[PDB]
């Protein structure tokens, strides 16, 4: 805030500068300019500091106080200043061009595109802004070589040439000036290719060339020939579609020239996306980045043959590089239907793993367990050097898959699906007996499952076969050859074992003793962007719900959990989306005292129906405090839990099916809120603050 952050500093700075009786003249100007560029938004103070100063920024900041009030004159001044710095001053020209493009985002006066012809039309109009814009765009020749001469944008239909020319000239000389150009070019090339697939496109020079090629016979048929060539190039083995129709009417030599003309008519049509990808790669090399990465990935997957000469040439050769810790979606595109795309993705992954390989935490080792043609080459490539850190993570993934589910209880869970199947079989057997292998061979799926459970179970690693498999060989006594009453044996031999205690869980000495034995391992980064030092402490069965397994790591402290029979892949995509969102807030996460940040959830999928995620950071649940309040109320009433959380609703809903309340639940809701204090969490954060000032920030 101006006062008294800057106004109080400039106050004494002016005095220190007024006594000229060293270098107190440049820092004073910098302070005055910083006070001027605020924005937002004292206008009187800005004008005062401008007059005081009146580091060339003082010439561009003045152009913003005008934008705040006079858009036209402000744009005029900005475009006039942009023509000024012809000398080697890069940090100012790009900034001026960016500030003018945003102001030029109108689209309100409609003079830039309306004067687009003025580029080469013997221009004599209209306003100083247009003249300065044309004079600055004409200077591009005096210095991503070319954007579009005649056909790329207006030849086939595109946005105003002014914005493109400005974004291209802003490239002088090096940072973020390529993002504003690449994003615009790609967003407009998308619509260009859409309209092409819907319409068509052709140029005068190539059309005249084609007309003069197939002479003498006639140019009338050449009209339809060029029209179909344009339509095909717009809609786009695709090259063969051109000859498919070219050989239909004419059916005639020139077979190679036809494709040469079709690869040019569709050349300027995709030149927009080509320049977009070029600018995106240039910006990635020079330095949102995730947006550019996703844009390049979508441009490559959508169509790689045009222009492959750019993607295949810039991706492998120093992509960023790399961006492995930004976009993990490269694997989803590894199984592309066309060649020349995975060949480059593999090299990109190898390069990203060669440096900072911890970013790709189990990127392919988990994938190979269940695309595979490339995952195999990516594993060894990313695991050849220093095989200790890769073999360690492979054995960790193996142990995690072993500890999942385990399926020792899945047998009873799958057998419990016979609520009416076994009963129907018994009824049919009784009917057959009344009449007197059909009934015995009616449960073939249950028999197959009971056989698979044993085929997978074999030699607390010794307990799974001596405690779970202790009666597994006898649990199928009648189920194997055959009522089927002998079925609860195995269902209770494993269920009662867990029910014996609440947090029934074994230490690292369980089926996966390597954890307790792995007293030291290399850095693994189990779902993070470095502390996997030796091993966690212990695990738990999470008696809260079913069915996680918390386990620390004590990395160079970091809890996690397992999830059997759960596809922890969409969860990873949602966490990546949340990370991208949070990155979208970093631009505004600057005081911004309550920093915008959506709490993450580190999820690492270890195969289909599995996953290893961090349990939680320090965070108390709200239901915890609600149950605490309920217990406190129960204690206060007794001295005058249950609650229960679910039965409490039905207890006050009886005196009102589904049901249609309708018109009655809105009353039970009030009766419950009128009893439960609304300050349960409020007082929770209030007492949980050591100070009254920390309370406000919290």
């Amino acid at each position: 805030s101006t006062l008294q952050l800057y106004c109080s500093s400039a106050l004494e700075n002016t005095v220190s500068n007024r006594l000229s009786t060293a270098l107190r003249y440049t820092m004073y100007q910098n302070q005055l300019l910083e006070k001027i560029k605020e924005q937002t938004v004292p206008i009187r103070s800005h004008l005062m500091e401008l007059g005081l100063t009146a580091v060339q920024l003082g010439k561009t900041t003045t152009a913003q106080d005008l934008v705040q009030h006079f858009k036209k004159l402000s744009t005029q001044g900005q475009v006039d200043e942009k023509w000024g710095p012809e000398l080697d001053i890069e940090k100012t020209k790009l900034l001026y061009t960016a500030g003018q493009s945003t102001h030029a985002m109108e689209m309100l006066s409609s003079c830039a595109i309306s004067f687009c012809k003025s580029v080469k039309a013997e221009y004599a109009v209209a306003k100083s802004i247009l003249t300065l814009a044309k004079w600055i765009q004409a200077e591009w020749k005096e210095i991503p070589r070319i954007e579009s001469e005649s056909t790329v944008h207006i030849g086939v239909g595109e946005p105003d040439f002014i914005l493109g020319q400005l974004y291209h000239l802003s490239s002088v000389q090096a940072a973020k000036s390529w993002a504003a150009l690449a994003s615009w070019a790609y967003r407009w090339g998308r619509k260009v290719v859409d309209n092409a697939s819907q319409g068509e496109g052709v140029r005068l020079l190539p059309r005249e060339k084609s007309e003069v090629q197939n002479l003498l016979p006639d140019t009338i048929t050449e009209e339809e020939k060029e029209r179909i060539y344009g339509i095909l190039g717009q809609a786009v083995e695709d090259d063969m579609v051109d000859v498919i129709w070219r050989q239909l009417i004419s059916s005639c030599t020139e077979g190679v020239i036809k494709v040469w003309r079709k690869v040019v008519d569709r050349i300027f049509s995709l030149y927009k996306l080509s320049c977009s990808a070029y600018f995106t790669f240039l910006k990635l090399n020079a330095g949102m980045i995730v947006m550019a990465t996703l844009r390049l990935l979508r441009l490559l997957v959508k169509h790689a043959g045009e222009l492959r000469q750019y993607l295949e040439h810039g991706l492998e050769t120093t992509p960023t590089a790399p961006w492995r810790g930004i976009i993990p979606q490269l694997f989803s595109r590894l199984n592309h239907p066309e060649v020349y795309v995975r060949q480059s993705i593999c090299n990109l992954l190898c390069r990203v793993a060669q440096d900072s390989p911890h970013l790709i935490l189990y990127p392919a080792i988990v994938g190979t367990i269940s695309m595979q043609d490339c995952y195999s080459k990516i594993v060894d490539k990313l695991s050849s050097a220093n095989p200790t850190m890769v073999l360690q993570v492979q054995m960790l993934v193996a142990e995690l898959r072993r500890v999942t589910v385990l399926w020792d209880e899945l047998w009873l869970g799958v057998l419990l699906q016979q609520h009416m199947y076994v009963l129907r079989r018994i009824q049919q057997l009784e009917d057959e007996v009344k009449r007197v292998e059909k009934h015995t061979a009616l449960m073939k799926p249950i028999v197959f499952a009971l056989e698979h459970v044993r085929s997978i179970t074999a030699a607390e690693k010794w307990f799974q076969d001596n405690y779970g498999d202790a009666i597994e060989n006898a649990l199928e006594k009648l189920k194997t050859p055959l009522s089927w009453i002998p079925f609860k044996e195995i269902m209770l031999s494993l269920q009662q074992r867990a029910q014996k205690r609440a947090s029934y869980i074994l230490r690292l000495e369980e089926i996966s003793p390597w954890l307790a034995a792995m007293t030291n391992t290399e850095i693994a980064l189990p779902g993070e962007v470095v502390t996997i030092h030796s091993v966690g402490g212990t695990i738990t069965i999470l008696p809260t719900k079913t069915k996680p397994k918390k386990l620390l790591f004590l990395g160079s402290s970091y809890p996690y959990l397992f999830k059997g029979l759960e596809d922890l892949h969409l969860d990873e995509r949602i966490m990546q989306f949340l990370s991208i969102v949070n990155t979208m807030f970093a631009t505004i996460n600057r005081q911004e005292t309550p920093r915008f940040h959506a709490r993450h959830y580190s999820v690492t999928p270890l195969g289909t129906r599995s996953g290893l995620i961090q349990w939680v950071d320090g965070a108390t649940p709200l239901f915890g405090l609600y149950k605490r309040w309920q217990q406190r109320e129960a204690a206060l009433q007794a001295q005058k839990i249950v609650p229960r959380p679910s039965e409490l609703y039905y207890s006050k809903i009886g005196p009102a099916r589904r049901d249609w309340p309708l018109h009655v639940m809105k009353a039970v809701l009030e009766e419950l809120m009128e009893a439960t204090p609304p300050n349960l969490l409020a007082k929770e954060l209030w007492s949980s603050c050591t100070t009254p000032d920390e309370w406000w920030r919290v």
């Binding site: 805030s1 006062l3 106050l11 004292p42 009187r44 103070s45």
Partner: protein
């Protein structure tokens, strides 16, 4: 009352140099039995220059115009008897030329408007007279401050 139990909250929120959303909350919270909060928080939302003319306007029509000679109100926006909130409008004297500017106009306006009422008090004029920009008058005025000056 609510009138006094809200100006304190607004001033507190302003002291944090942030939390203008917390003040807009009360601005939308006025349903519990005013528009003054909409501008009381506009100092950190948009700027200190702005939200100053808004407070002046909110001071009417409980008094005179109170407008200053040069305020640039034309383009400066393209970026009940209380007896307490009136003096509580002293926030102007912080959004007013208090931030370096010509402050005498606002003090004269406050004096002229208080001439028609009572219980309106401004801030220390001696502490504001340090804007002379000349060591002569600066020393002539600083010697009157509550503190004891020095002699080299």
């Amino acid at each position: 009352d609510e009138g006094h139990g809200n100006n304190q909250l607004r001033l507190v929120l302003l002291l944090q140099y942030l939390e203008n959303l917390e003040k807009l909350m009360y601005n939308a919270y006025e349903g519990c039995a005013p528009k003054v909060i909409r501008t009381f928080f506009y100092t950190n939302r948009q700027t200190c220059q702005d939200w100053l003319t808004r407070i002046r306007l909110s001071i009417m029509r409980v008094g005179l115009l109170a407008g200053q000679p040069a305020v640039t109100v034309r383009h400066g926006f393209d970026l009940l008897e209380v007896t307490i909130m009136m003096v509580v409008e002293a926030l102007c004297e912080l959004h007013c030329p208090e931030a370096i500017q010509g402050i005498a106009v606002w003090s004269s306006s406050i004096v002229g408007k208080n001439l028609l009422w009572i219980n309106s008090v401004a801030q220390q004029a001696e502490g504001r007279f340090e804007k002379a920009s000349v060591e002569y008058q600066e020393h002539l005025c600083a010697m009157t401050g509550v503190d004891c000056c020095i002699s080299s």
